[PDB]
């Protein structure tokens, strides 16, 4: 019902300005506290300061006093003037205040005002799922919403500057694709217009940043969405911000050191602590060495059998039900369902079955597994990386094999078939990064989900 | 033909491995370079390197002399070493070799060799959509194109660069929205799996960094690709990179400053110069202040008669008649087919009618305006600035007007009635920054289009 009044406060302020194309706003309350910090309070300096803020509260006694919020959460007596102040000021409402910066017997501003916004709904004084369909409101009436904004900046910011220090360059490579390759996944198709044919929102940017490489690219990188037209969950989102990242002359034991060194300088650039406190009253460590462990040996001991490439699927499926398709998918399978779940630590887990693996060169002296590796941080599928695979006959194969599982990316063999230096691929989902250093959902982590 | 003498180069090297997992490649040819920048000629230094490199020249004679071509363009005597060498190195084929380097009777590098690629195609010793269509390939065989690529790199960083300096946060944003806002453009529209609904590849940030704005945001921005369902053209791709920018207590004459210094800042950081030499010989100076002209009053002046605000459709009609829908996109209209095109330094042009404008706030003075910008750059449609419109109550008729020629974006609306700060926002397109600074094609600006 107060969006009726509201509406009407708006109505008979229209030759007052509601909405004002300017105010002379000349600091933040951050500004203005960074200024004042510790001042004899009840006492007043002659620093004037044009200051806006939301009045979040209100106090009105000949003297209102109301708690303009800037957006960032920082906190900071006309007759006529404290009428129109009464009669025109709600809550919600953007204020502008020029005036004496002075402390009360907690800083304040005490010589003119202005309505900046006229809001035509107070605050709500939140269920997750009116939170994340309404973070405008989230931002304004919850700090933690304000903090883990900031932070997702913040990581993001940390993982080019530590990958740009690092020589690496950012690329943009394609969103709309005429086929979209480079992971498993049903893509999203949207018709063109232009062309009139369904054109493919990247699964992955993996095959274009391949082909920089042959395109003579030293260190590539893209941090940018990724669309799975798949099913949401704790983990998963269709769409997503991911990081992929492309080094020569680097096998995946050189990529598993880098991904190491890389989130260590985000946890400490945007968190400040490798001790990641959690809402679990935990704290999660990610400092030092992280263990490396092969996932045939480690699925064998937590089997207590030898599980090999050459064991066969039969033999598989029937531990996969003592326990309750193919071969490296049923290895994958049981690996997770066994070690996957028991691991606490920062781990990587490599070698990986050569079926499940098809764009990851085959293992150096290992038979029947490719250099791949991925990362479980905190119990959370992290980040994965590649040896990557530059033989394109093989190639064609691995790809031709999944088909049959039938038209395959010429253009990227094509690329290929010129010459891709030896290079080691990465990828690292950044909302799974958030998760993972933060105790945070997924949809806590994305400004704009649904 | 060749196609097949080189796979059989491969088949037949497969215990030689032609894409090995790893090489030691202890330094770029950039490094070796950078290193021994004026060797006494046709002399040897003992310091050993590991290099690699494509063998893009060849010259067999006991000794044979390649072209190591490094990626970015850089470049750098067993008897079975030898056989082996000619027998098995074709041209494109990325090659390591450790040993000494020396310097010709040019820097070379003269005790072990291995194919680190070989490449199942040769390089074309090429037309503008086979340069493009084959990038990796253009980059490969042509300094330009690595130069180019190497350049948006070097503007999109310098554009980070610059707004960070400034207090700005780059902001993520969904990409999928159930209505894109934010432009006048026909969306691509997704079916999603999970939701089993359309959704729309954003048109623009706008709407969404609006949000933040009233979520208690000073300063963000967004740099990423936006998606225009309509034709590709010499100034317009369907997708294509974009920079958005919203600050608050800011009008469009704060938001014009920026903007030039901003792009400014990008031909330093990443051309070296304002006074940018172009293709056709000539030299396009951006150094220095900007001309502002009203749309209305140049347009006037252009046609020889006062128009207005208050110009019927059926005077501008005539005039537009005379010369060979609406009032705002006749304004628009005329301006460019007079002033517009007349225009070769760089100009903002400001003060836009209302109708074509849905999203600007009214002018603070000026009937009949908004308070818009756009600035033209060496006589490109380069970047927009407008004075942003938080009043909900117009803007909900802005859209009513749109609609008309019913469903409305009513979470925005919703958005701006908590209230939105006066701010001004900019948008920006990064292809048009590079053509507008370099007088390359859009086609030639992006790495992956079609
Ligand atoms: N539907 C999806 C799918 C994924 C993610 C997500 F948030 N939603 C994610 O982080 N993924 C991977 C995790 C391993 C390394 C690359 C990113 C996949
Ligand atoms: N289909 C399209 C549409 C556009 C552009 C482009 F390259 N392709 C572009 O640069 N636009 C504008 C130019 C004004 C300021 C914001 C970017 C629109
Ligand atoms: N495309 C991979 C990430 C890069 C892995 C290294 N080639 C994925 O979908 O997870
Ligand atoms: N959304 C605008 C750019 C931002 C203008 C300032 N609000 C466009 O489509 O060009």
């Not at 994340?132 to 500057?161: F, G, K, S």
């Not at 029937?318 to 994958?332: P, V």
Request: charged share 25%.
């Amino acid at each position: 019902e107060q969006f009726r009044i509201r509406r009407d406060k708006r109505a008979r302020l229209l030759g007052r300005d509601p909405y004002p194309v300017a105010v002379p706003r000349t600091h933040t309350l951050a500004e203005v506290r960074a200024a004042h910090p510790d001042l004899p309070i009840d006492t007043a300096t002659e620093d004037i300061v044009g200051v806006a803020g939301r009045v979040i509260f209100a106090r009105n006694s000949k003297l209102c006093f109301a708690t303009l919020q800037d957006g960032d959460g920082t906190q900071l007596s006309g007759q006529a003037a404290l009428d129109a102040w009464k009669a025109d000021v709600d809550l919600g409402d953007i204020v502008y205040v020029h005036g004496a910066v002075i402390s009360s017997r907690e800083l304040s501003v005490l010589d003119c005002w202005r309505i900046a916004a006229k809001s035509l709904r107070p605050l709500p004084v939140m269920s997750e799922e009116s939170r994340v369909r309404q973070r405008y409101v989230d931002l304004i009436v919850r700090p933690e919403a304000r903090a883990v904004a900031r932070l997702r900046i913040a990581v993001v910011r940390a993982i080019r500057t530590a990958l740009q220090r690092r020589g690496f360059l950012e690329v943009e490579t394609p969103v709309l694709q005429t086929l979209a390759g480079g992971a498993a996944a049903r893509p999203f198709a949207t018709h063109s217009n232009a062309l009139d044919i369904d054109l493919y929102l990247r699964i992955a940017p993996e095959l274009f940043l391949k082909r920089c490489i042959v395109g003579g690219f030293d260190k590539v990188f893209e941090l940018n969405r990724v669309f799975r037209n798949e099913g949401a969950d704790s983990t998963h989102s269709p769409e997503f911000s991911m990081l992929e990242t492309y080094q020569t002359y680097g096998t995946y034991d050189d990529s598993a050191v880098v991904t190491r060194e890389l989130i260590q300088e985000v946890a400490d650039e945007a968190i400040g602590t490798r001790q990641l406190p959690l809402p679990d009253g935990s704290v999660y460590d990610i400092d030092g060495e992280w263990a490396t462990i092969q996932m045939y040996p480690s699925l064998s001991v937590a089997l207590g059998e030898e599980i090999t490439p050459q064991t066969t699927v039969d033999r598989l499926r029937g531990i996969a039900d003592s326990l309750g398709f193919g071969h490296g998918k049923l290895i994958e399978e049981l690996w997770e369902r066994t070690v996957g779940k028991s691991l606490s630590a920062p781990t990587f887990v490599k070698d990986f079955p050569v079926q499940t693996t098809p764009l990851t060169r085959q293992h150096r002296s290992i038979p029947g597994v490719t250099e791949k590796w991925d990362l479980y941080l905190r119990g959370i599928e992290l980040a994965t990386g590649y040896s990557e695979l530059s033989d394109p006959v093989v190639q064609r194969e691995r790809f031709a094999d999944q088909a049959r599982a039938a038209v395959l990316d010429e253009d990227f063999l094509a690329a290929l078939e010129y010459g891709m230096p030896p290079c080691t691929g990465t990828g690292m989902g950044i909302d799974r990064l958030l998760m993972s250093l933060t105790g945070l959902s997924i949809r806590e982590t994305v400004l704009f989900p649904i």
